[PDB]
From Swiss-Prot, chain C:
Subunit structure and binding partners: Component of the mitochondrial large ribosomal subunit (mt-LSU). Mature mammalian 55S mitochondrial ribosomes consist of a small (28S) and a large (39S) subunit. The 28S small subunit contains a 12S ribosomal RNA (12S mt-rRNA) and 30 different proteins. The 39S large subunit contains a 16S rRNA (16S mt-rRNA), a copy of mitochondrial valine transfer RNA (mt-tRNA(Val)), which plays an integral structural role, and 52 different proteins.
Positions where Phosphoserine occurs in the chain: 24
Entry protein name: Large ribosomal subunit protein bL34m
Subcellular location: Mitochondrion
Naturally occurring in which organism (per UniProt): Homo sapiens (Human)
Family to which this protein belongs: Belongs to the bacterial ribosomal protein bL34 family.
Superkingdom of the organism of origin: Eukaryota
Curated annotation (Swiss-Prot), chain D:
Entry's family note: Belongs to the bacterial ribosomal protein bL35 family.
Subcellular location: Mitochondrion
Gene designation per UniProt: MRPL35
Biological-process GO terms, alphabetical: mitochondrial translation; translation
Primary localisation category: mitochondrion
GO molecular function terms listed in the Swiss-Prot or TrEMBL record: structural constituent of ribosome
Subunit description: Component of the mitochondrial large ribosomal subunit (mt-LSU). Mature mammalian 55S mitochondrial ribosomes consist of a small (28S) and a large (39S) subunit. The 28S small subunit contains a 12S ribosomal RNA (12S mt-rRNA) and 30 different proteins. The 39S large subunit contains a 16S rRNA (16S mt-rRNA), a copy of mitochondrial valine transfer RNA (mt-tRNA(Val)), which plays an integral structural role, and 52 different proteins.
Name of the protein this chain belongs to: Large ribosomal subunit protein bL35m
Keywords (A to Z) from UniProt: Mitochondrion, Ribonucleoprotein, Ribosomal protein, Transit peptide
GO cellular component assignments: mitochondrial inner membrane; mitochondrial large ribosomal subunit; mitochondrial ribosome; mitochondrion
From Swiss-Prot, chain F:
Alphabetic keyword roster: Mitochondrion, Ribonucleoprotein, Ribosomal protein, Transit peptide
Family, per entry: Belongs to the universal ribosomal protein uL2 family.
Keyword Ribonucleoprotein recorded: yes
Gene from which this protein is expressed: MRPL2
Localization terms from the record: Mitochondrion
Subunit structure: Component of the mitochondrial large ribosomal subunit (mt-LSU). Mature mammalian 55S mitochondrial ribosomes consist of a small (28S) and a large (39S) subunit. The 28S small subunit contains a 12S ribosomal RNA (12S mt-rRNA) and 30 different proteins. The 39S large subunit contains a 16S rRNA (16S mt-rRNA), a copy of mitochondrial valine transfer RNA (mt-tRNA(Val)), which plays an integral structural role, and 52 different proteins.
Main location: mitochondrion
Protein name: Large ribosomal subunit protein uL2m
Chain positions covered by the region annotation Disordered: 204-217
Record GO biological process: mitochondrial translation
Full-sequence range covered: 61 to 300 of 305
Record's GO cellular component terms: mitochondrial inner membrane; mitochondrial large ribosomal subunit; mitochondrion; nucleoplasm
Organism, as annotated: Homo sapiens
Molecular function terms, GO-annotated: RNA binding; structural constituent of ribosome
UniProtKB/Swiss-Prot annotation, chain G:
Tissue note: Found in a variety of normal tissues including spleen, testes, thymus, liver, kidney, brain, adrenal, lung and retinal tissue.
A GO biological process held by the record: mitochondrial translation
Further facts: Potentially represents an important therapeutic reagent for HLA-A24 patients. This antigen is recognized by tumor-infiltrating lymphocyte (TIL) 1290 in the context of HLA-A24.
Compartment(s) where it occurs, according to its Swiss-Prot or TrEMBL record: Mitochondrion
Protein name: Large ribosomal subunit protein bL28m
Assembly with partners or alone: Component of the mitochondrial large ribosomal subunit (mt-LSU). Mature mammalian 55S mitochondrial ribosomes consist of a small (28S) and a large (39S) subunit. The 28S small subunit contains a 12S ribosomal RNA (12S mt-rRNA) and 30 different proteins. The 39S large subunit contains a 16S rRNA (16S mt-rRNA), a copy of mitochondrial valine transfer RNA (mt-tRNA(Val)), which plays an integral structural role, and 52 different proteins. Interacts with OXA1L.
Domain of life of the native organism: Eukaryota
Boundaries of the annotated transit peptide in chain numbering: 1-54
Gene Ontology MF terms in the entry: RNA binding; structural constituent of ribosome
UniProt main location, coarse: mitochondrion
Cellular component per GO, a single term: cytosol
Keywords: Mitochondrion, Ribonucleoprotein, Ribosomal protein, Transit peptide
PANTHER family per record: 39S RIBOSOMAL PROTEIN L28, MITOCHONDRIAL, LARGE RIBOSOMAL SUBUNIT PROTEIN BL28M
Length: 76, 137, 45, 95, 95, 234, 243
RNA sequence: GCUAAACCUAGCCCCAAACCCCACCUUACUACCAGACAACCUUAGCCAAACCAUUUACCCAAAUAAAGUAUAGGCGAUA
RNA sequence: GCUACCUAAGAACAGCUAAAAGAGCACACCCGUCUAUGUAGCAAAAUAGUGGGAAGAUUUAUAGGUAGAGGCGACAAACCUA
RNA sequence: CCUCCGCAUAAGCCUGCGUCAGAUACUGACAAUUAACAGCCCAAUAUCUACAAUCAACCAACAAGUCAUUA
RNA sequence: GCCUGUUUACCAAAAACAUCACCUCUAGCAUCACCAGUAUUAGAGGCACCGCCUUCCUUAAAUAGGGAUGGCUCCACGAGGGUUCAGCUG
RNA sequence: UUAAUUUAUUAAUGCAAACAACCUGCAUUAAAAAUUUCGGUUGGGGCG
């Protein structure tokens, strides 16, 4: 029995537009419009990086990348 | 599908409880072979014309017997005056004979203890009823 | 006994008849459009 | 009937009248006798002969039929071999 | 495919005009459902030996299911187009 | 409606979880089940129904210590906090489960039948025929779903091949692979039947709303040959 | 008052005004032209005239198409011009009985199709009519390239058409790279459908998509007036020096 | 003689012609944080048929005429 | 935003008798048995007295939810902005 | 002589008996409510959290409950 | 009518509705209600706690009132419908 | 409601379709409903 009901789990992203499956053509998305419209393909935005260090919007590295991380598990 | 439709006829169209249907299947396996429509007619014959309620229909293996025998004996008694269909209130002038006394007993015992008539008259009535059924169909 | 069916509360007022809720559905958008066409000074509540 | 149609504004014709009555251009309306095809086995020869006849209509009936039909049905028709060509006009009629 | 037909005939529209439909023209009756038609066969030209059908370059009438599910998807057969027929004809006459 | 299920927690824990009542309403806000609403506020204790759940980086049969047996507001049966290795979990306590007792959870189907001690979990194949069981799975590793109410106990009626026939408390036969695990003995709180609600207020505390005041009166439709005898006048 | 133009000509006027005017001529013609789709849900009359049995006279006959509803799911698949028939029926097929709403839906299958030009396999929700059309066309590529927009009636189908046409127009080496002979064979097989890339780029684009494409094409950050004035002054000085 | 009464233009109707700084979707008019939900889907009924149940005219791409004709229709109201 | 029910998280319940009570008497509070006034009224259902409950199936503030071929209902066909 | 009340907070309202000058708590103008009270919050990733409240101690329980952190 | 409670907001508060208790029917089961539940459970409904077996009297006059599986059974309670002692009183 | 007409809708099955299930088409059976009506005389009521 898994904990966390599907309806509460994060919704799956909508399926990609079929236009993206055609090798030779560049899809026409609403990225240029800088806003969503329902009759254009949904852009695939590249991952974004803030570019600097903002303390109030900090995203710590994964636990495995911390300097003090150790395979041996201490018990505190 | 045959088994399921038999069970569905017994439950939805005959309003037998689940336990009642299981007991009916246990006691009268021939119901499964019996075709639909005929089974419903037999049950409604017991229910309306004979005024037998589901607990009695199940307790006495009424569905075991054949519709021909059931109609023969029951209509013979009804025309003789021994049997009487219950009224709207479910009451009868004279208590009706028991289903075991009608169907389970042999022909001679049924004619002597309950009908109190002659085998010759019973044969004549059986032929007449068969002719009437043929004409009706 | 009757008459005071209105028990004012700005939270309920805005959440029930506000601009955001009217735009939240196509029917509310058409409500706002009807008010604009009629020339209502107050489009929403 | 429809005095002004919704598409042309014209007066319409009750086609039930056209399917049943003949108009002679003189203004008379001819018809069959009701029941002339019904249960002939129980009707006497004289009654059958009466029923098999083509019959004129009343003045009021003719007026009603004229109202119910438009002018197109009240024109001169020079059909090739019309059996009613002679009957289309009146002769030796005083008032 | 479901093929339907109007219960009520649509009045002629004209040459350049479009027919004007009404509520009664939306009433349909099913004349035929193509899926219930008897199955036909697909003509294919085999490219590789396949059990119980043929060897290579021979026209074969195969059940549409087999043609569209195994032969064509796996390349064991090609459509019996005029071009393919010609090419396999040259193959045969060269062999 | 803006209804989101409170069953959103993803990681198992021992803490009672604040649970939101439904009132018999769907996520759409409409009543779907009647007679539900109100009652005492409750906190949910996540029960681990997969009693053979060997700890991380561990395997094989393991023992556990019954830390305590507690009343569960969300169940008829009472629960038991039980600890093994370096973890604690809630389970459904059996009739004679006591604090400080030892519990065994094994996946070993021994050639001989294992001595059935109440409270431990063995695969159904390892139990002697006729032993009382509960917290039975439908499939291997699915998790206990049957025989979970207070005082209920199924019977391991038969074992043939890899299939065991169990008698559910409703006296219905059920076929389950003998590798599926079940716990021995009858569920706790056996006297739940005899509890007397005493007053309508106690039901309202339990969260059951009163039945509808409407008076509810199907019927066998007579066949044409029988329509003449339906309502014979007196 | 009265509008200067009929309301039904407003779309055409909008096309003749604005960025839609700047759209390429061939695309505008493709949008404007409309052809009746091939009959799918009705059997067309064989001839234009028919001798009606009632009065035995010759009468003109017309093929009035059945309105078809195409749910958006269709645009993600390849239905052979097939769609939902939202109509009405007479219970027991007699006009003197009740009239009931009736929706006839097509039987949809999930099938995998390989595109030779695109060298890709697509899983598409498809109809038996579409499969029959593909068989008649001798392949998915031929079916897509032959069937016009109206008959194809699928946004995914038109996108496949655009991709195939662009591939053919560019003679893209990305088709089976390292196999030039196979690439040339495929292009020769589908040669007849090749069209100029400038036209293939706009095949199957909706009006909104074409507008967005035109805007992206013609969007340019304004040139600083410093450059323009420097060029103008330098040219003027050149003229002054020469004359 | 009080209440009053009187007014003429504010405008409107029908056609023709002609195509038409800042803030604001959060509680709108709110300077400034991790998105994702996005749209399309037979009008119905009143009413007429003297009830009503099949049926009952409606931005259609040139006025007129063919013509209320051919046709449709509980072959009836009507179309 | 009334009202029917529900969800989240709150709040109120003097005093006496009893003892851990859907207990008794009785404030606040909720209700509305009977009488009188009033009846274009203070009031489109009120006032005075009298009365039922008043630690519970209680009352109640806040926000949210269920919407009409529906909702909600300890069925009165009650309530869903007089 | 009355006191059911009253003073504050909440909610609601929005200048609605403060001054001046005029009409007959109205009009026009002028002024005014100053934050400590209250609202307006929280950097991530995992990980933590069984033991009510009731003077919380006896005692009694049932309807089984509002109060927490670590690396 | 078991009881406490609920109801026709604005003419009916009741014997009506609910109600513990009992009875009937349906269901062998997971990730949005039932339910993060599992037949001692859940839903639908009936009925109503529990418990059992199978001519005279009142007045002087009293169409008022009381006594000689269901069915019976009034302990307690009631602004319920009747009757009544004594007292009290315009 | 055992008034008339329907199954549009759900639930089942059957036959097709397609490769057991799902989906679609066509049937059958139920549940649920939907539209519409409830002639005339005989003081009312019952039976007539
Ligand atoms: Mg309120
Ligand atoms: Mg013309
Ligand atoms: Mg009418
Ligand atoms: Mg107190
Ligand atoms: Mg009390
Ligand atoms: Mg009632
Ligand atoms: Mg009533
Ligand atoms: Mg009572
Ligand atoms: Mg009471
Ligand atoms: Mg209530
Ligand atoms: Mg009232
Ligand atoms: Mg009252
Ligand atoms: Mg008296």
């Amino acid at each position: 029995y898994e904990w966390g009901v599907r309806s509460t789990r994060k919704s799956e992203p909508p399926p990609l537009d079929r236009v993206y499956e055609i090798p030779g053509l560049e899809p026409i998305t609403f990225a240029g419009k800088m806003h969503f419209v329902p009759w254009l393909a949904r852009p695939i935005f590249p991952p974004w990086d803030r570019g600097y260090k903002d303390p109030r919007f900090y995203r710590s590295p994964p636990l495995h990348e911390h300097p003090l991380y150790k395979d041996q598990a201490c018990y505190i | 599908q045959d088994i399921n439709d038999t069970v569905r006829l017994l439950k939805e169209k005959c309003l037998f409880t689940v336990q009642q249907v299981t007991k009916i299947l246990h006691s009268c396996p021939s119901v499964l072979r019996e075709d639909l429509g005929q089974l419903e007619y037999k049950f409604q014959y017991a229910y309306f014309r004979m005024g037998i309620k589901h607990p009695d229909i199940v307790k006495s293996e009424y569905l075991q017997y054949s519709l021909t025998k059931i109609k023969q004996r029951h209509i013979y008694l009804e025309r003789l005056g021994r049997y009487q269909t219950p009224d709207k209130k479910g009451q009868t002038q004279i208590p009706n004979p028991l289903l075991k006394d009608i169907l389970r007993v042999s022909e001679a015992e049924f004619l002597a203890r309950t009908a109190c008539t002659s085998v010759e008259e019973f044969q004549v009535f059986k032929k007449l009823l068969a002719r009437e059924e043929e004409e009706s169909e | 006994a009757r008459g005071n069916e209105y028990q004012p509360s700005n939270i309920k007022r805005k959440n029930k008849h506000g601009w955001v809720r009217r735009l939240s559905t196509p029917a509310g958008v058409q409500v706002i459009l009807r008010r604009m066409l009629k020339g209502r000074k107050s489009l929403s509540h | 009937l429809t005095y002004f149609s919704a598409r042309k504004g014209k007066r319409k014709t009750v086609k039930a009248v056209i399917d049943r009555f003949l108009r002679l251009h003189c203004g008379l309306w001819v018809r069959r006798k009701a029941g002339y095809k019904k249960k002939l086995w129980k009707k006497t020869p004289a009654r059958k002969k009466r029923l098999r006849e083509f019959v004129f209509c009343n003045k009021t009936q003719s007026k009603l039929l004229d109202k119910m039909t438009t002018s197109f049905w009240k024109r001169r028709n020079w059909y090739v071999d019309d059996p009613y060509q002679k009957y289309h006009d009146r002769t030796n009629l005083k008032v | 495919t479901v093929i339907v037909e109007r219960w009520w005939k649509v009045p002629l529209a004209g040459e350049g005009r479009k027919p004007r439909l009404h509520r009664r023209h939306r009433v349909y009756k099913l004349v035929e459902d193509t899926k219930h038609r008897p199955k036909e066969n697909l003509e294919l030209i085999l490219t590789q030996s396949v059990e119980n059908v043929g060897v290579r370059g021979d026209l074969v009438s195969v059940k549409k299911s087999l043609g569209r599910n195994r032969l064509l998807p796996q390349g064991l057969a090609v459509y019996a187009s005029p071009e393919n027929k010609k090419l396999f004809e040259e193959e045969k006459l060269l062999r | 409606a803006n209804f989101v299920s409170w069953k959103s927690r993803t990681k198992y824990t021992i803490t009672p979880v604040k649970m939101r009542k439904s009132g018999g309403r769907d996520h759409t806000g409409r009543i779907r089940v009647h007679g539900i609403g109100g009652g005492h506020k409750q906190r949910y204790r996540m029960i681990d129904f997969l009693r053979f759940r060997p700890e991380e980086t561990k395997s094989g049969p393991f023992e556990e210590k019954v830390i305590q047996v507690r009343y569960d507001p969300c169940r008829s049966a009472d629960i038991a906090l039980v600890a093994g290795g370096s973890r604690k979990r809630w389970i459904i306590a059996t009739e004679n489960m006591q604090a400080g007792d030892t519990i065994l959870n094994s996946n070993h189907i021994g050639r001989m039948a294992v001595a059935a001690r109440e409270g431990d979990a063995h695969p159904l194949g390892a139990l002697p025929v006729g032993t009382l069981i509960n917290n039975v799975e439908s499939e291997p590793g699915r998790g206990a779903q049957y025989i979970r109410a207070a005082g209920t106990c199924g019977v391991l009626l038969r074992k043939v091949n890899g299939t065991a026939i169990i008698q559910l408390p409703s006296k219905r036969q059920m076929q389950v692979l003998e590798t599926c695990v079940a716990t021995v003995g009858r569920v706790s709180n056996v006297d739940h039947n005899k509890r007397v609600i005493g007053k309508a207020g106690r039901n309202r505390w339990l969260g059951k709303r009163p039945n509808s005041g409407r008076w509810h009166r199907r019927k066998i439709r007579p066949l044409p040959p029988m329509k003449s005898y339906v309502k014979l006048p007196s | 008052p009265l509008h200067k133009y009929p309301v039904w000509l407003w779309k055409r006027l909008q096309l003749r005004e604005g960025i839609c005017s700047r759209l390429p001529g061939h695309y505008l013609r493709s949008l404007e032209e409309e052809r009746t789709p091939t009959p799918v849900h009705y059997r067309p009359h064989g001839a234009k005239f028919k001798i009606n049995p009632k009065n035995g006279q010759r009468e003109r006959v017309e093929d009035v198409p059945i309105p078809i509803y195409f749910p958006p799911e269709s645009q993600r698949g390849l239905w052979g011009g097939e769609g939902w028939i939202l109509g009405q029926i007479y219970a027991n097929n007699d006009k003197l009985s009740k009239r009931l709403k009736k929706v006839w839906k097509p039987q949809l299958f999930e099938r995998e199709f390989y595109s030779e030009i695109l060298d890709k396999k697509f899983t598409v929700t498809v109809t038996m009519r579409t499969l029959d059309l593909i068989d008649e066309a001798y392949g998915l590529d031929f079916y897509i390239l032959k069937t016009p927009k109206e008959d194809l009636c699928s946004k995914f189908g038109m996108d496949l058409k655009r991709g195939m046409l662009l591939r053919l127009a560019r003679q893209d080496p990305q088709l089976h790279p390292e196999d030039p002979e196979r690439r040339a064979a495929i292009y020769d097989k589908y040669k007849e459908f090749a069209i100029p890339e400038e036209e293939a780029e706009w095949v199957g684009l909706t009006l909104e998509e074409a507008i967005e494409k035109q805007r992206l094409l013609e969007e340019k950050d304004p040139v600083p007036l410093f450059k323009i004035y420097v060029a103008e002054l330098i040219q003027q000085l050149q003229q002054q020096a020469l004359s």
